Write a protein that binds this ligand. Structure first.
Ligand SMILES: Cc1cc2nc3c(=O)[nH]c(=O)nc-3n(C[C@H](O)[C@H](O)[C@H](O)COP(=O)(O)OP(=O)(O)OC[C@H]3O[C@@H](n4cnc5c(N)ncnc54)[C@H](O)[C@@H]3O)c2cc1C
Ligand SMILES: Cc1cc2nc3c(=O)[nH]c(=O)nc-3n(C[C@H](O)[C@H](O)[C@H](O)COP(=O)(O)OP(=O)(O)OC[C@H]3O[C@@H](n4cnc5c(N)ncnc54)[C@H](O)[C@@H]3O)c2cc1C
Ligand SMILES: CCCCCCCCCCCCO[C@@H]1O[C@H](CO)[C@@H](O[C@H]2O[C@H](CO)[C@@H](O)[C@H](O)[C@H]2O)[C@H](O)[C@H]1O
Ligand SMILES: CCCCCCCCCCCCO[C@@H]1O[C@H](CO)[C@@H](O[C@H]2O[C@H](CO)[C@@H](O)[C@H](O)[C@H]2O)[C@H](O)[C@H]1O
Ligand SMILES: CCCCCCCCCCC1=C(C)C(=O)C(OC)=C(OC)C1=O
Ligand SMILES: CCCCCCCCCCC1=C(C)C(=O)C(OC)=C(OC)C1=O
Ligand SMILES: [S]
Ligand SMILES: [S]
Ligand SMILES: [S]
Ligand SMILES: [S]
Ligand SMILES: [S]
Ligand SMILES: [S]
Ligand SMILES: [S]
Ligand SMILES: [S]
Lengths: 421, 421
């Protein structure tokens, strides 16, 4: 309402949860902050690969949202948005109720585009997913069925994927768990299929010695690896793969039987968001300016995987650059600051800052991590690390983030940097 | 004087220069700030290895101090301190004049302890030094004499050394320059001798894959490498080396002819500082608390290589941990803050923060760098990087630091971190 703006945050994930707390803290008691999300619980996404191999349980990485945001004055609606009318500024929920907003912050993350590859939906065949805790529990169930009846394994990343780290991670811990169960030698073949132009490209043209280190890691585990691949269909428990060369010409086709599989799908924008006229690019990603404001609607902002970021490279098989946690939080922080500014007359000048990608993968006793910025080479920081300490950092960060999501965030978030001061 | 404290900074190096500017900025017009140093010019130390192989000239890395600090209100005395009387609070200069102080900040850096190894002084034999621009110009002159009359090369680090990075760097660029001159095949032998327990220990128990990467680098260049070595004497152009095992027992002795050599010496405290009764440990390093205040004299502070830092490890051949640029600046910043606090009644609570080591080495087209913290394992950050980007960062940092040393420093120094914002 006038003088008491209603700010709605769509999606309670890595960007949306923090955004709700920060929005409420920034606006105070004079404004209404409503968080709307498809699930009633928060999940810590980077832990999903561990759930998928049974090293972690749902209860370790997820928790009910309601009580935590409500005690901060935030209204919570555990309902999926089905439709967004940007003119009337109304959101239609799954149950048919309508929520009005004065400002909308879209943090809806990715639609997992299984439809790009017929048969690839986790519910339609042997190719599973670890993108969400629901999918990862199902992936683990299929992993156990593999343990009962050993057969070929295929893990990797589809054409259009932008999130390659977790595929390597999942391949490695699957291999590790198989060894730990004395079951590794029962596996007929273990294949890694990726749309990357080379191993360890990671959608960012490589970082540090990612290529050499990931190549050697897969070889150490007896995992045969194919790059420049796109999967055309999954059918009769077989994966039809087409491999191209630098100029997109087919250099071979393959048919791989799959008893147990996991391919990271391409990400698109979720339907309620993509469905908003003039809001998104053809992928369903929100077109925003440097202030996280939609280029079409001045009272719509976006952060997280939901926003569109221009490519800088074009690979033989389509691939995308990842949108990772630290950059997401900078997007959120910026959106909250600029919305508050709007409420108080000013144009917020805050931006996301420099593009960066940061990723941590835990293999059990040791981890791998990278940091790359900015997007294009030569970079200011281009590092790849491996060791027990990376594992310890992942464990520590997970504990911290989950606690923050329960206790609330003021907050210039990453002051997890005073481990210096 | 009372109500107008006189603050003296001893030594105009990596810590002392910034300290003088920051002290003056922090105290203002009501207090006198005097900078006293042995040389009338500032030099950028990390560039010395390049001078030593002729890739850089003195004029690229050094400049006259006087006009730059004087225009900030800082008094400059280009004279070495010979004696410090901590009771009377008087400093005796080389020319016999005496300077009184109310507060003294010691930033005198290392005494290069050539006396530990008879014959090892650059002026007494073939073993040269790249620790200072004076030494590096002499090292380069000897390098040219090697070019005229090829003979064996020995590069490395003495027992008690704490600064290993530059030895590896110097070995690598010497090898590289020899190749570029079509002179590499004329060299009878190229040996690397270190007190480290293994290649790439770096006095910090290794960082990232420093061991594997430095080992392979030396092998690539046809440099034969010996660890756990101490040099007992240099005599008749021969280096007498003793190699021990884990328990300090001699496993062999060697006599290496040397036409051209460069060994990083052990560092001690400079004589004027070490000579102050009760100020220093037996190495001549100032004993300070976490606030950079001498444990004996409350109006004496210290920062940089001059302070004592307890060992965390004890190697078969004595070695030390390095004290590098970012930690030095945090020491300086702390000392300045706590001295100002003292002037205004309070006890400054500011500390150096977490121990860390950061180092950059430029090989020409590509560089190697590391970051390690804290000192003891398992670390929070333990990274080793290599690439063209490391080279670009070194080049950039040198330009920045030198410019800052001319323009002055307010200043919470490392905001060379807003390459993010
Ligand atoms: C397996 C995996 C591992 C990852 N590892 C890392 C890592 O190590 N480091 C790192 O920095 N990043 C990592 N990422 C990338 C990225 O940080 C995460 O994907 C992150 O969760 C993205 O945050 P988000 O807020 O944009 O989307 P999400 O966290 O997915 O949140 C989106 C939210 O919106 C909700 N939603 C969607 N549609 C609707 C709708 N119509 N109505 C209401 N709610 C809706 C969803 O339920 C969800 O709650 C990982 C990604 C995955 C998939
Ligand atoms: C070859 C080399 C490479 C290095 N590379 C790196 C690097 O890559 N990264 C990094 O972070 N660190 C590096 N270091 C380590 C460290 O950062 C430097 O040694 C740094 O210069 C130390 O700063 P300081 O202020 O303690 O001493 P210094 O910079 O040596 O300054 C001491 C000053 O005190 C003066 N002085 C000494 N005695 C007296 C006296 N009696 N009276 C008056 N003045 C006196 C000296 O002339 C000098 O000006 C390098 C060291 C060396 C030697
Ligand atoms: C985070 C995003 C990236 C993708 C996710 C993770 C992918 C899986 C990683 C597989 C790597 C396994 O392979 C491992 O690599 C490193 C090489 O750097 C080796 O380790 C080597 O360097 C490390 C330091 O970095 C040293 O501590 C170690 O002593 C040395 O041997 C290991 O001996 C090898 O076993
Ligand atoms: C900064 C303090 C440390 C000491 C100072 C410097 C010591 C000298 C460094 C010698 C290293 C030379 O050896 C070099 O190492 C790296 C391995 O990581 C290799 O490079 C490898 O990893 C890098 C990334 O980190 C990739 O960009 C590269 O494509 C890959 O081949 C090079 O092919 C090899 O030539
Ligand atoms: C340029 C700054 C990078 C941040 C590095 C320090 C600590 C944070 C690690 C990165 C990270 C972030 C930011 C993060 O938000 C996240 O969760 C989605 C992770 O997964 C575990 C991460 O690993
Ligand atoms: C933990 C923070 C580390 C700082 C990294 C970012 C940029 C600075 C590089 C380190 C460095 C410092 C601090 C530094 O003071 C210095 O000069 C003595 C260098 O030599 C070139 C350095 O390489
Ligand atoms: S997935
Ligand atoms: S990702
Ligand atoms: S990734
Ligand atoms: S990631
Ligand atoms: S040296
Ligand atoms: S050093
Ligand atoms: S070093
Ligand atoms: S260094």
């Amino acid at each position: 309402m006038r003088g008491s703006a209603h700010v709605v945050i769509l999606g309670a994930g890595t960007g949306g949860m923090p955004a709700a707390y920060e929005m409420k803290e920034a606006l105070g008691s004079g404004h209404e902050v409503t968080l709307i999300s498809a699930n009633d619980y928060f999940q810590f996404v980077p832990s999903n690969p561990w759930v998928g191999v049974g090293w972690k349980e749902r209860d370790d990485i997820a928790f009910p949202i309601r009580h935590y945001v409500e005690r901060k004055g935030i209204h919570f609606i555990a309902q999926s948005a089905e439709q967004i009318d940007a003119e009337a500024q109304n959101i239609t929920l799954a149950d048919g109720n309508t929520v009005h907003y004065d400002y909308l912050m879209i943090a809806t993350g990715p639609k997992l585009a299984f439809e790009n590859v017929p048969g690839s939906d986790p519910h339609e065949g042997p190719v599973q997913s670890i993108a969400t805790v629901d999918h990862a529990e199902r992936a683990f169930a299929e992993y156990q069925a593999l343990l009962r009846e050993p057969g070929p394994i295929v893990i990797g990343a589809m054409a259009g994927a932008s999130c390659f780290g977790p595929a390597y991670e999942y391949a490695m811990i699957v291999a590790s768990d198989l060894k730990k169960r004395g079951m590794r030698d029962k596996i007929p073949s273990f294949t890694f299929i990726t749309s990357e132009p080379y191993i360890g490209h990671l959608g960012i043209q490589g970082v540090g010695d990612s290529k050499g280190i990931l190549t050697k890691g897969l070889k150490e585990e007896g995992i045969e690896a194919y790059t420049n691949c796109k999967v055309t269909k999954v059918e009769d428990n077989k994966m039809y793969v087409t491999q191209v060369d630098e100029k997109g010409e087919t250099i071979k086709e393959m048919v791989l039987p799959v008893k147990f599989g996991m391919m990271i799908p391409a990400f698109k924008g979720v339907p309620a968001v993509a469905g908003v006229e003039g809001l998104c690019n053809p992928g369903g990603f929100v077109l925003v300016d440097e202030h996280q404001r939609s280029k079409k609607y001045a009272n719509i902002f976006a952060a997280g995987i939901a926003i569109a970021i221009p490519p800088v490279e074009t690979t033989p098989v389509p691939t995308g650059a990842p949108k990772t946690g630290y950059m997401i939080e900078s997007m959120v922080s910026a959106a909250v600051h600029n919305i508050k500014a709007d409420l108080e007359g000013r144009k917020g000048e805050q931006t996301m800052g420099t593009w960066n990608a940061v990723c941590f993968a835990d293999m059990g006793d040791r981890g791998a991590a990278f940091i790359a910025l900015p997007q294009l080479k030569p970079r200011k920081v281009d590092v790849f690390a491996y060791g027990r300490w990376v594992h310890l950092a992942k464990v520590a960060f997970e504990k911290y983030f989950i606690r923050k999501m329960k206790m609330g965030v003021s907050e210039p978030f990453y002051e997890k940097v005073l481990f210096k001061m």
